[PDB]
Amino acid sequence: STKVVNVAVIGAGVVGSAFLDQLLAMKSTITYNLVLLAEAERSLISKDFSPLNVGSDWKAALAASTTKTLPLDDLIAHLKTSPKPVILVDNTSSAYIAGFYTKFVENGISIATPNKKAFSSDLATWKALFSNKPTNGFVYHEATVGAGLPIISFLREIIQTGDEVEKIEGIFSGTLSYIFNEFSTSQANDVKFSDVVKVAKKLGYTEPDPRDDLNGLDVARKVTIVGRISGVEVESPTSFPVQSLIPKPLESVKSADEFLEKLSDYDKDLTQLKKEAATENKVLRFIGKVDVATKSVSVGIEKYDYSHPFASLKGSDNVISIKTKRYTNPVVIQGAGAGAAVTAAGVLGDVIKIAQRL
Amino acid sequence: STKVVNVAVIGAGVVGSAFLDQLLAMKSTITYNLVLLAEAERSLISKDFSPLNVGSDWKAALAASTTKTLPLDDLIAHLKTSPKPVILVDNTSSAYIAGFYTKFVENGISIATPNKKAFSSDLATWKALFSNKPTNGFVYHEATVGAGLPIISFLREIIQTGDEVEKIEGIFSGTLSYIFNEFSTSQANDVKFSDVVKVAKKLGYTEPDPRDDLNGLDVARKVTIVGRISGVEVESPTSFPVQSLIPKPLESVKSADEFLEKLSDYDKDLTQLKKEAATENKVLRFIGKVDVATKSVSVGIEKYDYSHPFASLKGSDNVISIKTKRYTNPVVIQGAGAGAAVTAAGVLGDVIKIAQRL
Numbered sequence A, B: 001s002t003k004v005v006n007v008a009v010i011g012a013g014v015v016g017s018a019f020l021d022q023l024l025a026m027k028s029t030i031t032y033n034l035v036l037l038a039e040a041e042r043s044l045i046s047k048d049f050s051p052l053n054v055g056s057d058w059k060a061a062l063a064a065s066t067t068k069t070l071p072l073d074d075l076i077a078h079l080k081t082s083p084k085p086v087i088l089v090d091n092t093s094s095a096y097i098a099g100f101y102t103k104f105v106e107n108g109i110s111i112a113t114p115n116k117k118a119f120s121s122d123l124a125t126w127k128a129l130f131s132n133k134p135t136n137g138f139v140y141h142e143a144t145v146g147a148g149l150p151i152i153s154f155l156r157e158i159i160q161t162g163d164e165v166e167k168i169e170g171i172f173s174g175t176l177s178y179i180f181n182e183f184s185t186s187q188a189n190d191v192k193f194s195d196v197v198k199v200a201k202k203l204g205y206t207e208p209d210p211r212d213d214l215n216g217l218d219v220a221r222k223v224t225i226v227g228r229i230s231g232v233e234v235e236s237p238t239s240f241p242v243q244s245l246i247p248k249p250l251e252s253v254k255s256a257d258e259f260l261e262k263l264s265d266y267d268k269d270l271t272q273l274k275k276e277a278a279t280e281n282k283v284l285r286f287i288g289k290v291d292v293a294t295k296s297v298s299v300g301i302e303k304y305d306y307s308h309p310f311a312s313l314k315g316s317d318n319v320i321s322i323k324t325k326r327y328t329n330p331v332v333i334q335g336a337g338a339g340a341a342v343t344a345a346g347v348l349g350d351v352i353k354i355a356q357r358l
C-alpha cells in the first residue's frame, strides 16, 4: 500500500494553527510526514526530507528555528525532488501564493487550500487546475466554501453521477450573517446598521477592517466557485451584481477607526429598507445566489419570511440550499461557516481525501 | 495513475436500475468496467473480465440471457481472478447476500452498496468489514443513511480529523418523514394518521404492507449505523428503545388490508398527541437519536417546536443533526433521503470514491 506521503505546510495563523494541532494528534492508518513548516520568514524545512523534530510543539520550535523562509519559485523546485507523494496546505489568504497554484500542480505537488483567490480569480486559471492531465497534482478546497462543511465535496460528486444543478441560495458569510441576523430580526427592533457593525468589530467578528467584509467580496468569490462547479461560466468575482454595504463615499475614509464613526451617517437607508421590510412581514439577510438556468449570479440583501429557516440562524452559521434536478426539494446544509478548528478540520479532512488517492 | 477498476453489480430492481443507467452515462476521468450484472437468475457475467459490450437498454440484455447467476460462495471464489482490484455494487437488501460481505473484504473485494443489512447485524460482523486489513476490500454505504446526502463520509471524516460526535439526531425514514410531514404541520391540520398512511400506501411511498414501515425497523437500523460510527457499541437494531408506530392489536392481523381498515381505530391516540402540540407551538416527528456521552440510542416520537427546522420539512426529506466537540453549533444536513436517482447516485458516487483508491 501507499502509507508514505510527505506534506508541506505554509501558514500557521489560525486555521493554520488548528490544522497543525490536528494533523499530528490525528491518529490514522496512513502516515503523514510534515517535511516543512514555513511561516512568514521563520520556517522549519527538512532537507533530509523526513518527518520533522517539532512534535506537538511547533510554537517556538518554528520561532527559535534559525531558518529563513524558502523562496516560492525555489520551493516548487525543492519538492520536485521529494521522497514519496507530497502535499501542500496553504493556510493563507495571499493571492501571491495561489497565483502560483499552476506551478505547484504542474509539478505533481498536491494542494488542499481554504484560500479562494485561485478558485475565484481567473477563469482560465480554473480550466487547468482541474484538467484531466494525470501528471499534475490534486487540488481540494472544501474549506473555501463549506468550511468544515462538505459543499464542494458533495456538489462535484452529485454532478458526475449526472445530476444537474439549477439554483443555489445561501448565507456564505459569517460576518454578514451575524450582522444581519442581529440588525434585522422577527422581533422587530430599530438597531442601526452602524452600531451593529461597530459591536461586531468590537467582538472581532469582522476583519480588522470591516470593509473587507462589507463589500461582498468574500461572498462574491465563494459564489463564483460554487457557481463554476455548478456549471456556470463566471468570468470573475465581479462579473455579476454584488451589493456592497460600504457607503459609496466612505470607501477610503482615512483609517478603519475613521470609518466606523463615519459610517453612522448612512443608516437612514438600510433602516428605511428594514422598516419597509416589516410591512411585507420580512427579515433582512445577505445571501449568495446562482441560478444555473439563466446563468444569473448575484450577491446582496434578500428578504426572507419568518417561517423560512434562514430567518432562524444562530451565531455565525453558513446555510446553503441546493435545488437540483433530482433534488426538486432543495438540500439544505447549514453549520459553522467559520472557525479555527471547524475550518482546519475541513482542510485536514481534505488532505486525507488526497492521501487515499495518491 | 489507476483509472482501471472492475465492478460487479448485483440487483437491478429500482435503485439498481437507476444505478446502472447512471454508471454508464457517467462521463468521468476514471474508467469503470462492469464485469458482471447478476439479477435473480438471469445474469451477465464476463469470464474474460472484458467489459459488457452492450450499451443502453441493458435491461433486455440481462432479462434475455442464459448464464445462470453464479453462487455467492462461488463468486468471491471467482472474482479474485480479477486483473484489477474489484468492487461490489449490491443494489439489494437481503440478510443473505449481506451476510457475505466480510467474505468479500477478507479476500480483497471492495463493496459499494445501499444495503442497510451487513451494517446492522451485530458488533462482530461489523468489525470484520472495517478492520483496515491490508489486502482487505473497501466498504462504502452512503446510500444506507439519508440516501445521497453526505452522512457517512462527513462523519468518517470530521472524526478522522479528530472530531468526537457528541449527539447525532434526525429523521431517517423516507416514508415516516413523508407521513409526518403531512400529519403534523405548522398550521393545526386535521388529517387522521391512518389517512395520510393509506395515501402513502396508494402512491407507493410505503411498502405493500405499511406495517413494515411503522415498526421503526428501518430507522432503528439507520441509527445503529450512525451510532456505531459515532462511537457507541450498539449490539443490534433492537438493542434499544424503538417505538413501533403499529398499534399493539393490529400487529397480529394477517390481511395487509384488515390492518389498514382498522388503523383508523387508533387515530385518536396519535391525534391527541398532535393536539397536545398546542404546547406552545409544536409538531410531531419520528426521529433517530444517538447520545454518545451516555451511550444512549433510541428511535421514536419526539415533539419539536414550530420554529425548529424539523417542523418545516417538505416532501419526504431526511434531516440529521450532528452536534460535536468542534461543532458545538450542530451541523444540520437535510435533503432527499429516498429516491431512485438520488439513492443510486449516492452509490455511484461511492463506487467512484473506491476506484480512486484502488
Ligand SMILES: CC(C)c1cc(Sc2ccc(O)c(C(C)C)c2)ccc1O
Pocket: A092, A093, A114, A115, A116, A172, A173, A174, A175, A176, A205, A206, A207, A212, A213, A218, A337, A338
Ligand atoms: C480565504 C479568505 C477569504 C480569508 C478567510 C478567513 S476565515 C473567514 C471565513 C469566512 C468569513 O466569513 C470570514 C469573515 C470574518 C471575513 C473569515 C480569514 C482571512 C481570509 O483572507
Ligand SMILES: CC(C)c1cc(Sc2ccc(O)c(C(C)C)c2)ccc1O
Pocket: B092, B093, B114, B115, B116, B117, B172, B173, B174, B175, B176, B205, B206, B207, B213, B218, B337, B338
Ligand atoms: C436497505 C433497506 C432498508 C431497503 C431500502 C429501500 S429504499 C428506502 C430508503 C429509505 C426509506 O425510508 C424507505 C422506506 C420507504 C421503507 C425505503 C428499499 C428496500 C429495502 O429493503
